[PDB]
Design a protein around this ligand. Sequence first.
Ligand code: HEC
Ligand code: HEC
Length: 228
Amino acid sequence: TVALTVPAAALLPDGALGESIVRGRRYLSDTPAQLPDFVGNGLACRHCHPGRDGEVGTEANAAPFVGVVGRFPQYSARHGRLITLEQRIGDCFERSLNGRALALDHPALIDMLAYMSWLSQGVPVGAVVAGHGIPTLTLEREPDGVHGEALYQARCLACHGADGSGTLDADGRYLFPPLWGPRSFNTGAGMNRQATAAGFIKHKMPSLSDEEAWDVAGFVLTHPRPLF
Ligand code: HEC
Ligand code: HEC
């Protein structure tokens, strides 16, 4: 694998590409507000693909976009065939944002691609970046949702709410996003899988033990959310 690196915003090119990258960043950080026809819930891309310093998709083990463009096209078991990055983004619009895929030549889609290509600057095509994806966490026992409930109240609730509905910021965007219910991700999302949720929670919290991450993920995933 190659190391995860984040290019400097100060070195962005003047011109059409620079401008596109900037719009891309915004669509990824502010998605429900910038793309209302395509988003069906309260989530922005940055709520599962967080980043430091205004960027999006730059954190190891939280599915960073750094280096993503060199990994597509790739086989998708979901589709039964090779898919492009444009299509992969479409899947997260339909599942994670409970919405609709943008047309494959939609200029907002091309802006998001330009942003991801900028983040992938210097990464060799084909190379795998350290920290890519969300590494799964799997324990050899059932997730204990009773224990999980107690852990939720002690470690999560303060941010994500008793009802899992999250906390709105002053501008109507989620400061702390919703974890279940009608504004959360739908059942088709990868985050609706126990080992992916457990792994995401384990790595994004710093901190929880493996058993704790496993059990609280189980509790979160007992709740209703939109059907895909
Ligand atoms: C207690 C262990 C928990 C659990 C189970 C979760 N969280 Fe959070 N969370 C917070 C913020 C600002 C985000 C957006 C991403 C970021 O910038 O880091 C998240 C994201 C999540 C997700 C994915 C998004 C979703 O809506 O499903 C999940 C599954 C999740 N969290 C679970 C903020 C906080 C906190 C404020 C300091 C605290 C405490 C937690 N989260 C704790 C938990
Ligand atoms: C949590 C509810 C998510 C939101 C909101 C979005 N995405 Fe997502 N994405 C999510 C998971 C759990 C994964 C799988 C990670 C893995 O281990 O592979 C993804 C994956 C992507 C990818 C593929 C990344 C790769 O390395 O292959 C892309 C390009 C992607 N997601 C884009 C994306 C965009 C553009 C979003 C806002 C529209 C978005 N995602 C939201 C979980 C979530």
